[PDB]
C-alpha cells in the first residue's frame, strides 16, 4: 500500500493515523506525482469508513469542463449535451470517503458550491432543486500553497479554513532520500506483477545512482526511470538513465 | 452571548439598546470574527424574538442566485426559473433577516434593496405584485462602507439607511480576553458528537493561544482548536503558522 | 416647511413666487439636504395643490426601468413587458411631477423628455399614440448642470427649459440656523411614529450639533438623531466620530 | 421676423432674393439663435407660401428614428415598424422642408439625402417604390460644414448641393440692436397664454440685457425673460445671468 | 463638353481616338471637375452611341447596395432580397457602362469585376447562371490608382485592365481658359429652363472668376454662378464669400 | 510565344525534361510574367497532353469560394450550397491542374491539399466519399516559398511535396531578347478581333520597348502595346510609359 | 530498416529492446527524418506483428477533426457529424497506433489522451459508452517536450507517460553514413514504380551529397534525388541546391 522508511515520512504516517480515526477533512500538500494517492487510500483504510466507498477525482484532469457536473451530478437537460441523469461523485462516496485531487484548480464559483456542500452536508445535482443528504469524509490535495492562493484572490478564505484543519505536507523525493529504494522496488514490483513478470532486484550501484539524483519529477520521474531500466532489462545494473 | 472582554461586553450592552427598537443594525469588523451570534443575540433580545430568524451570506450564493434568493421569483423569471419560489424577505415576515457581507451586492441589487427598505414592500423577479413586508433588517460588512461609497461601489442613500447604529466587532487580538472562553466553547461544541470535552486545554496552551495575533480571527481559532483535539484529547502542544 | 435660517427663508420666498406659476422649477444643492420639502411645499403653494403629486427618483430605478416608468408602455414594447402600464406623467395629470436627480438620464432619454416638455404630449413605449399632458414639472440635481452640458453629458436645450428658475438649497453647514429646528422636528416625528412623550435636548448637545460640518447634511443628521433616541430619550451626548 | 440690426436686415433682404427661387438654402449660425423663423420667413416669401411647411430637428429625434421619419417606412422595415408611415418629404409635397441641424446625419443617411436631392424622388425604408418629389429644401447647421467635410464627417458632393446660397445668422452679441425687440416679442409671446404683456421698462433692464454677451443666445434670453416675469410681472431690473 | 484651353482640346482629341474603339477608359482628375460628360462624349463618338448608356456612382450607393446594384441578384440572395433584379451590366447590354469613382470598391468586389472583365460574363447575386455580356466600360477615379495598388487597396491585375488608356482631366485652375466658356454655359443651361439668358456679365466679374484658384473646381463654379444669378440678372459682383 | 532569349530556351529545355514525367512542377517568378505559357507547354509536352488542362487562380476567387471550387461540394455543405458541384480536381481527371498563385491558400486549405497529393483522392465539402484521382499537378507562386515556410505561413511538408522541380520564370527585363517576339504576339492576338495585324512595330519603338525595365512585366507590356494601337495603326513612338 | 551509421544502428538495437515490450515509445528528432519506417519497424518486431498498424498525423488533420478522428463520434456529436464513426484507437485494437507530431495536440485533447492511457478505454465523442482498449502507443514529436511542458503547453503527467523510452533520430548531418544508402533506396524505389528501368550513381555526385548539411534532412534528400532522376535517368553529377 504505502511502504516508506524516511523517519520524516514515518512521522507523517503517524500523523495520518491520528486523523484517520476522526472524520476531519484532510488536506495533503506537496508536489504532484509525489505519492499523495496512497496516503489518501491509507487514511480511508485506517478510518472507521474503511469498508465504505473510496472515490477519487482529479480536478486537474477532467476534460471538456466536466468537473462540476462530475462532482455534483446532473439531471437531464441541465446543460447542453446532458442527455441523461447522472449521479455525482459525492453521491457515490456516501458512507465513505472522497478524494478531491488538485483542488486548487476549481474556479471560485465551484468553490462556493463545494463550500455549501461542506457546511450543509448535502448536495444538489445540476438542474435540480432537490438536496441529497450526505455522509461523506473529505480528503483533498493541492500542489500549491493555498494560503498564498487565498491571498492572491483565487481561493476562498472560508473554504481554505474548512479544508485546512489538518494539513499534511508530503515532502519531495530529494528530502526523504531513505524512501528511494523501497519506493523503487515497490514500483518495480507493481509494474512486473501487472505484466505477469518475475520481479527483479536493484544492484547496489544502481541504488546509489538512484539515491544521488535530485528527482525534479519526484515519483512520477522515478517510476519512469525504473520502467526504462526494466526495458534495458531484468535485474537492474546501472541501466538507470537520468539525463545522459 | 459568550464573551468576557470588557470591549465585547460594552458592545452587547449597545446591542441590548437597539434590540429594543426596530432600527437597522450594521455589524462591522472582520469576517469570521463571530458576527452571526451578535445578530442572533439582537433578535433574541428584540420583541420579534418569537418570529423567524433568516440569514443569508451575500458572498456565498453561487450561480448568481443571490438576487433570486433575496426577492424570490416566479416561474420563467430567468433561465432556470422553472418554478415559483418565495424570497428570504417573505420567509422573515414578522421576524428578522440578516444580510451578511452586504458589501458584495452589486449596485443594481443595492437599488432594489433600497426600495424594499423604503417601501417595506417586495416583489418577486418576474412579478409586478408587491408583498407588504414587516421585517427587521440586520446586515454585516467586513469593509468600511463609507469608503466603499466614496469609491463608487456602494449607494450613498443605502449606506445612511443602514448606518443608524453601526456596531464594530473587533478583531480577536483586540479582544484578547475572549480567546480562552471562546476556545472552550469551540471545544465543547465540536466534541458534542460523542466526545467527552477535554478541559480548558493546559495552561501553557492557553498562553500559547493568547500570544498569537489571530490574523484569521475566530475561523482560525476554530481550526487550531479542532486540530489540537485531533493531535489529541486535553491539549498542550499544538500548532500554528510558524510551527517548528 | 421647517427652517429659520435667513438663506432658507429667502429661498422659500422665491419658491412662493414660482409656485404661483406653471414654470419648471430646478432644485439644486446636495442630495439628502432635504430638498423634498421644497418641491412638495411648492406644489402645495401652487394652484395645482389639490392635484396629484408624483415623485420619481431617476437615480434609483432598478433594471433600467426608468424610461418605462416615466413614459409607461404597451404590452410587448420590450422584453418583460407582459402588460400595458401608464407612465408617471399620465398619473401626474392636472398636478405635479417631481423628477428627482435628473442629471442621471442618458442622452436618448433627455431627447424624449425634451419632446414631452415642448409638445406637452407623451407616448408610451411601443405605442404611436400621443397623450395630451397638463403637468407641472419640478426637478432636482446635485450636479451643476451647466458643466454637465459643457462636458457633453446633458442637452443644452433641455438645460435651458429646466432652468428658468433654479433654486439652490445649500449644505447644512451653510444654514446652521436650520439645524436645531430640524433636529427637534425629526425627533418629534420619530416619536409620534411610536406614540410617546418627546424628550429634551441638552444645551451642550445642541452646541455639539451646531459645530459639526455635516458632510452628509440632513441624511447624516437624521442618523445622528435616530441613534441618539436609541441611546435613549433625553439627548445629552450622542454623536458622529468616537475618535 | 421682428428685427432691427442693419446686419439682420441685410440678411433678410438676401433671404427675399432666394425665397423667390427654388434654391436650397443653408442657414449657418449658432443653435437656438432664431433660425427657425428665417426658414419660415423664406417659405412665406416664396411662391410656395401656401404649401406645407415641414420642419425636422436632426439632432433631437430619439431612438435612432431620424432616417425612419425622414423617408418613412413600410410595415416591417425594421423591428418596431408595425405599420406603414409617410416620411417628412411626402408631407412637404408642394411646399418646403426644413432640416435643422443637418450636420448630425451619419454618412449613410447623407448618401440617401444626396440621392433624394439629385433625383427628386424618395423611397420609404423597406420599399422599392420611388415617390417623385416637388419639395423646396431648407437646412441649418450650427457648425462650419466645410471644415466638417475636410474632417471626413460630411460628404463633399452633398455640401456643394446645399451650399448654393448659405446665409449666416449671427450670434446675439453680434447684432445687439435686435436684443430689445427680441426681448419684447419673447415677453408677449409668453404672456400670450393668459397674462397681460408687461414692459421691459427703461434701461437698467434694457442696457443690462444689452451689455451681456449671451453665450446661450436667444434660448438664454428667452430664459432670462421668463425668469424676470416670475420675479415679477410689471416692472423690471430683476434680470439675472450672473449673480 | 464645352472647352478651350488647348489642353482640354487635346484631351478630347485623345478621347475621339479611344471612342472609336472598344477599350476600357479610365478618367482621372478631381471629382466635380466635369468628368461626367466626357464619358458621355465618348459614348456618343463611339459605334455604340445608339445603345444604352448606364452610369453608377460607386461612392454614393447607400446601405452597402453597390455590389447588388452592379451584379443584380435573385430573390433571397441577401437579407431583404425580396425580388429578382437585374444588374447595371445587364442594363448596359450592347452599350456602355460608366463606373464612377471606382477606387471605392472593396477588394472582393474588385475580384468580381475582374472576372466580369475577363470572361465578359456576369452572374447575379445568389445565382450561378452567367449572362453573356457585350458592354464597353468607362471608369473614373479621383485618386492615383497606381499608388492605391502599391498601398494594397487595389488589385494590380485590375489596375492594368482598366488603365490601357487613361485620360487625366485637370483641375480648373490648370485650364483657366475653360472657365468663362463653362460659366456662360451654366448661365445658359439654367436660363434655358426659365427665361432670357442673362450673361452680359461684366468683364470685371469675368476677371474675378478667372483669378480664383477654384479649390472646388466645377462644382464650386456651379455654386458661384447659381448664387450670382440669384443676387440678380446680369452678373456684376458675386461671392466667394464677402471676399476672403 | 515562340520565345527567344537564351535564358528562356533553357527553361523550356528543363520543362521538357520534367514534362515527360508525372512530377509536380512549381513555377516561380513574378505574377503576370507569362507563367501561363510554361504551364500550358508542360501539359502539351507531357504524356497527358490530350487530357484536360484545368487552371485556377487561387488569388482571384471572390466570396472565399476557393476551397469550394477546388474540392467541389454537396448541397448544404455551406450556407449557399444549394447544389452539388464537382471540384476542379475531378475535372482534371486524366490530365493536369494548374494551381496559380498557390501561396495564397490559408493553412487549413494547404493541409487539405497536402492530403489530396498524398492519397491521390479528394472529398467534396459536406461529403465523406473519396474520389480516386489521376491528376498531374502544376503550381505557381510569386513568393519565395521556402521563406514563406520559415515565416509560418506555408506548410513545410507541402513545400517539400511541391518542390521536386522548381522553375523560375524570369522577369521581363531579365529576358530582354523575348520582348520583341512577345510584343508582336500580344498585338497579333489582340487584333484577332477583325483588326488587321499591325506590322511588327517601328524599329525605334522596339528599342524604346527594350530599354524599359518593365516593373509590371508582361501585363504592363500588354497594356502599353494596346495603348499604342489606340494611338492608331503601326507603332512608332506611340509607346507611353510615364510620358 | 535502411541504415549504416553506427549511431543509427545503436538506435535500432534500442528499438529492438523496447519492441518486445508494450511500453509507449516516443520518437524525437526532426520531422521529415524517417520516423515512419522506425515506428513500423517496432511494430513488426513486436509481439503485435500481425495486428493492425494505424498511423495519424496530429499536425495534418484539417477542419479541426483531429479529436473526432482519434476518438470517433456518434451522430449529432458536433455540427456536421451526420453518422457514427469509429476512432483511430478502435481501428488499432490488438495492434499499434502511431501518433505523429503529438506536441500539436491542445491541452483539452491531451487530457483526454491521458485518460485513454490510464484507463485503457475510449469514449466516442457524444457517447458515454467506454470501449475497452488493447493498443500499443507510439508517438513522435519534433519538439523538445520537456521544455514544452515547462512553457505550459504540455501536460506533465502525459509527458512522463509518453517518455519512459525516448529514442532520438538525429538529423542527416549527424549521421552522414546513412546518406548514400538512403539515396540508393530512393532511386531503387522511385524506378521500381516506373517502367522498371535500371539505376546507377557516380562517385563525384556522392561526394556532393555527402558534403551538404541537409537542412531539410530526408525530405530534402528525396527532392534532390527525384530531381536528379528527372534531370537524367543514368549516372550523375547533376545534384542540385546550387
E239 at D interface, C-beta within 8 A: no
Cβ contact, residue pair G60, F111, below 8 Å? yes
E157 in contact with F at a CB cutoff of 8 Å? yes
Q: Which of A195, A189, A74, A92 is nearest to A134 (CA)?
A: A92
Taking the C-alpha atoms of residue G165 and residue G169, their distance in angstroms, rounded to an integer, is: 13
Which residues in chain G are closer than 8 Å to A84, comparing Cβ atoms? Answer: 128
Q: Cβ contacts (< 8 Å) between G30 and chain F: which residues? A: none
Q: Which residues of C touch D222 (CB under 8 A)?
A: 160
How far is residue C7's CA from residue B41's CA, in Å, rounded to a whole number?
A: 47
Q: Is D80 helix (H, G, I), strand (E, B) or coil?
A: coil
- Provide CATH 3.40.50.300 ranges for chain F: 1-172
Measured between CA atoms, the residue of chain G closest to residue F77 is: G80
Beta bridge partners of D140: D27
Put simply, the answer to whether F62 touches E111 (Cβ < 8 Å) is yes
A174-244: which CATH number, 2.120.10.30, 3.40.50.150, 1.10.8.60, 1.20.120.1200? 1.10.8.60
Nearest one of A219, F194, F222 to E164, comparing CA atoms:
F222
What span, in angstroms and rounded, lies between the C-alpha atoms of E234 and E201? 5
A200 inside 8 A of chain G by CB: no
CA distances from F52 to E119, F93, F113, G239 (A): 20, 7, 20, 33
C-alpha cell at G230: 528527372
Give the integer Cα–Cα distance in Å for E93 and E95. Answer: 5
B61 has a chain A CB within 8 A of its CB: yes
> Is F5 in contact with F161 (CB distance < 8 Å)?
no
Instruction: Count Cβ–Cβ pairs < 8 Å, chain B vs chain C.
Output: 39
Q: CA B149, CA B140: separation in Å to the nearest integer?
A: 15
Q: How close F104 gets to chain E, by Cα (Å)?
A: 14
Q: Where are the alpha helices (DSSP H) in chain F?
A: 6-19, 35-45, 66-71, 88-91, 107-119, 145-150, 156-162, 179-191, 203-210, 217-230
Residue F155 Cα to chain centre, angstroms: 21
H helix count then E strand count, chain E: 10, 9
Q: Which residues of B81-93 are buried (b: 16+ CB within 10 A; e: fewer)?
A: beeebebbbbbbb
State the chains in contact with C (3 or more Cβ–Cβ pairs under 8 Å): B, D
Q: What is the 3-state secondary structure (H, E, C) of chain C?
A: CCCCCHHHHHHHHHHHHHHCCCCCEEEECCCCCCCHHHHHHHHHHCCCCCCCEEEEECCCCHHHCHHHHHHCECCCCCCCCCCCECCHHHHCCCCEEEEECHHHCCHHHHHHHHHHHHHCEEECECCCCEEECCCEEEEECCCCHHHHHHCCCCCHHHHHHHCCEEEECCCHHHCHHHHHHHHHHHHHHHHHCCCCCCCCECHHHHHHHHCCCCCCHHHHHHHHHHHHHHHCCCECCCCCCCC
Residue (of G107, G102, G90) closest to G139 by Cα position = G102
Is G237 near chain A, with CB under 8 Å?
no
F165 touches chain G (CB under 8 A): yes
For residue E119, what is its C-alpha cell? 470572361
- Which chains pack against F, by 3+ Cβ pairs within 8 A? E, G
Those of residues 100-129 in E touching chain F at CB distance below 8 A are 108, 111-112, 114-115, 126, 128
Please, is F206 exposed, middle or buried when counting C-beta atoms within 10 Å of its C-beta (0-12, 13-18, 19+)? middle
Answer whether F115 sits within 8 Å of G223, measured CB to CB. Answer: no
Query: Strand G130-132 relative to strand F165-168: parallel, antiparallel, unpaired?
Result: unpaired
Q: Which chains, if any, share at least 3 CB pairs under 8 A with chain A?
A: B, G
Q: In whole angstroms, what separates CA D193 from the centre of its chain?
A: 24
Q: Does D210 touch chain E (CB under 8 A)?
A: no
DSSP label of A48: T
Question: Going by beta carbons, is chain G in contact with chain D, meaning 3 or more pairs sit under 8 Å apart?
Answer: no
Q: Residue G129 has what DSSP assignment? A: P
Distance CA A69, CA D108 (A): 50
C-alpha to C-alpha distance for B31 and B34, rounded to whole angstroms: 8
Whole-angstrom CA distances from F65 to B178, F104, F115, F125, F139 are 78, 13, 19, 11, 19
Residues pairing with F140 in the sheet: F27
Q: Cα distance from D73 to chain E (closest Cα, Å)?
A: 14
For residue B164, the chain C residues in CB contact (below 8 A) are 223, 226-227, 230
Could you say which DSSP state residue A74 is in?
Answer: B
Resolution in A: 2.3
DSSP per-residue letters across E37-69: HHHHHHHHHSTTTTS-EEEEETTS-STT-HHHH
Is residue C65 within 8 angstroms of chain B, CB to CB? no
Query: From CA B138, how far away is CA B27, in angstroms rounded?
Result: 8
Angle between helices C36-45 and C6-19 (to 10 degrees): 40
What is the separation, in whole angstroms, between the first and last Cα of chain G?
31
How far D164 CA lies from chain E's nearest CA (Å)?
5
Instruction: Kindly determine whether residue D114 and residue E230, on different chains, have CB atoms separated by under 8 Å.
Output: no
| Class at the top of the CATH hierarchy for domain A1-173 | alpha beta
**Distance of alpha carbon A13 from alpha carbon A7, whole angstroms:** 10
**Mapping DSSP to helix (H, G, I), strand (E, B) and coil, where does residue F27 land?**
strand
Cα distances (angstroms) measured from residue D231 to each of A171, A230, C15, D184, D228 = 87, 105, 10, 16, 5
DSSP string for F112-175: HHHHHHHHSEE--BT----EE--EEEEEE-SS-HHHHHHTTSS-HHHHHHH-SEEEEPPPGGGS
Other CB atoms closer than 10 Å to residue A194's CB: what's the count? 8
Experimental method, per PDB record: X-ray
How far is Cα A27 from Cα A36, in angstroms, rounded to an integer?
A: 10
Q: Which of these, E223, E222, E232, E231, lies nearest to E198 by C-alpha position?
A: E232
- Cβ pair C62:B111 closer than 8 A: yes
G54–chain F nearest CA distance, Å: 15
* Residue of C62, C232, C233 for testing the chain B interface, max B β-carbons within 10 Å: C62
G56 CA to chain A: closest CA distance, Å? 21
Alpha-carbon distance of G20 to G37, in angstroms, equals 17
Q: Do chains A and G touch (3 or more CB pairs under 8 A)?
A: yes
For the record, the C-alpha cell of E83 comes out as 425580388
Write out the E strands in B33-163. 53-57, 72-73, 85-86, 96-100, 121-123, 130-132, 136-140
Give the three-class secondary structure for D56. Answer: strand
Cα radius of gyration (chain A): 20
- Region label for A174, one of left (φ > 0), alpha (ψ between -120 and 50) or beta (otherwise): alpha
Please give the angle made by the CA atoms of C81, C84 and C89, to the nearest 5 degrees: 110
Contacts 24+ apart (CB under 8 A), D228-232: D229/D187, D229/D190, D229/D191, D229/D198, D230/C17, D230/C18, D230/C21, D230/C23, D230/C164, D230/C165, D231/C17, D232/C17
Residues in chain G closer than 8 A to A220 (CB atoms) = 156-157, 160
Domain E173-244 is found in CATH 1.25.40.10:
no
The phi, psi pair for B222, rounded to 5°, reads: -55, -45
Chain F CB contacts of E23 below 8 Å:
226, 230
Whether D228 contacts D186, CB under 8 Å: no
For residue E241, cis peptide bond before it (omega within 30 degrees of 0):
yes
What are the residue ranges of CATH 1.10.8.60 in chain E?
A: 173-244
Residues of chain B contacting residue A164, judged by C-beta atoms under 8 Å apart: 223
User: What is chain D's percent helix, strand, coil content, to nearest 5?
Assistant: 40, 15, 45
Among partner residues E60, E230, E232, which is closest to D23 by beta-carbon distance? Answer: E230
Nearest to F39 by CA among F135, F138, F142: F138
Whether the CB of D79 is below 8 Å from some CB of chain E: the reply is no
Class of domain C173-243: mainly alpha
* Contact yes or no for D126/D167 (Cβ under 8 A): no
Written as nine digits, the cell of A244 is: 545522459
Cβ atoms of G164 and A232 within 8 Å: the answer is no
Query: What is chain B's Cα-based Rg?
Result: 20
Minimum distance, in Å, between the CA of residue A120 and any CA atom of chain G: 31
- Taking Cα atoms as reference points, which of A242, A240, A180, A171 lies closest to residue A211? A180
Cell digits of residue C116 = 414631452
Q: From the CB of residue A26, how many other CB atoms can be counted at a distance below 10 Å?
A: 27
d(CA C6, CA C176): 10
Cα–Cα dist G224/G236, whole Å: 12
Going through chain A in order, the beta strands assigned E by DSSP cover 26-29, 54-58, 97-101, 122-124, 131-133, 137-142, 166-169
Cα Rg for chain F, rounded, in angstroms?
A: 20
Query: What contacts F148, CB < 8 A, 6 or more positions away?
Result: F103, F141, F154, F159
Phi, psi for D54 (deg, rounded to 5)? -120, 120
Closest CA to B68 of B85, B54, B44: B85
Residues of chain G with CATH 1.10.8.60: 173-242
CA distance A88 to F223: 75
Task: For G173-242, give the CATH class.
Answer: mainly alpha
Q: How far apart are CA F21 and CA A106, in angstroms?
A: 61
The conformational region for residue G64 under phi > 0 = left, psi -120 to 50 = alpha, else beta, is left
Choosing among D26, D164, D167, D170, which should be mutated to test the E contact, i.e. which has the most E CBs within 10 A? Answer: D164
Query: Which run of H or E residues covers position F22?
Result: none
C-B interface (Cβ pairs under 8 Å ≥ 3): yes
Instruction: Check CB contact under 8 Å for C165 and D232.
Output: no
Report the DSSP pairing between strands F121-122 and F72-73: unpaired
Report the distance separating Cα B35 and Cα B41, nearest Å: 10
Q: How many residues does chain A have?
A: 244
HSE-CB at F76 with a 13 A cutoff on CA atoms is 4
Pick the CATH number of G1-172 from 3.40.50.300, 3.30.1050.10, 3.30.1360.10, 3.50.7.10: 3.40.50.300
Cβ–Cβ < 8 Å for C21, C160:
no
C-alpha C233/C-alpha B21 separation (Å) is 13
- What DSSP line would sit under D133-164, residue for residue? ---EEEEE-SS-HHHHHHTTSS-HHHHHHH-S
**Residue B38 to residues B26, B138, B188, B235, D224, Cα–Cα distance (Å):** 11, 10, 20, 29, 59
What CA–CA distance (Å, rounded) separates E59 from E143? 13
Helix then strand then coil, in percent of chain G rounded to 5, is 45, 15, 45
3-state secondary structure of G73: strand
Amino acid at each position: 500500500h504505502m511502504v516508506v522508511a524516511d523517519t520524516k515520512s514515518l512521522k507523517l504516517l503517524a500523523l495520518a493515523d491520528k486523523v484517520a480515526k476522526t472524520d476531519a477533512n484532510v488536506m495533503i500538500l506537496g508536489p504532484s506525482g509525489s505519492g499523495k494517492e496512497v496516503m489518501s487510500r491509507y487514511i480511508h483504510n485506517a478510518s472507521p469508513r474503511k469498508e465504505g466507498p473510496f472515490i477519487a477525482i482529479n480536478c486537474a484532469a477532467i476534460p471538456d469542463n466536466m468537473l462540476e457536473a462530475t462532482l455534483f451530478g446532473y439531471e437531464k437537460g441541465a446543460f447542453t449535451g446532458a442527455v441523461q441523469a447522472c449521479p455525482g461523485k459525492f453521491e457515490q462516496a456516501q458512507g465513505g470517503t472522497i478524494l478531491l485531487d488538485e483542488i486548487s484548480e476549481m474556479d471560485l464559483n465551484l468553490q462556493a458550491k463545494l463550500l455549501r456542500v461542506l457546511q450543509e452536508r448535502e448536495v444538489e445535482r445540476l438542474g435540480s432543486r432537490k438536496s441529497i443528504k450526505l455522509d461523506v469524509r473529505v480528503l483533498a490535495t493541492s500542489n500549491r500553497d493555498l494560503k498564498q492562493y487565498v491571498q492572491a484572490g483565487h481561493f476562498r478564505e472560508d473554504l481554505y479554513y474548512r479544508l485546512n484543519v489538518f494539513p499534511l505536507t508530503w515532502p519531495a523525493l530529494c528530502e526523504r532520500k531513505d524512501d528511494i529504494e523501497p519506493l523503487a522496488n515497490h514500483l518495480i514490483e507493481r509494474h512486473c506483477k501487472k505484466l505477469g513478470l518475475p520481479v527483479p532486484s536493484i544492484a547496489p550501484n544502481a541504488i546509489t545512482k538512484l539515491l544521488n539524483y535530485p528527482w525534479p519529477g519526484n515519483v512520477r520521474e522515478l517510476d519512469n526511470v525504473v520502467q526504462r531500466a526494466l526495458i534495458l532489462s531484468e535485474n537492474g545494473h546501472i541501466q538507470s538513465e537520468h539525463i545522459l
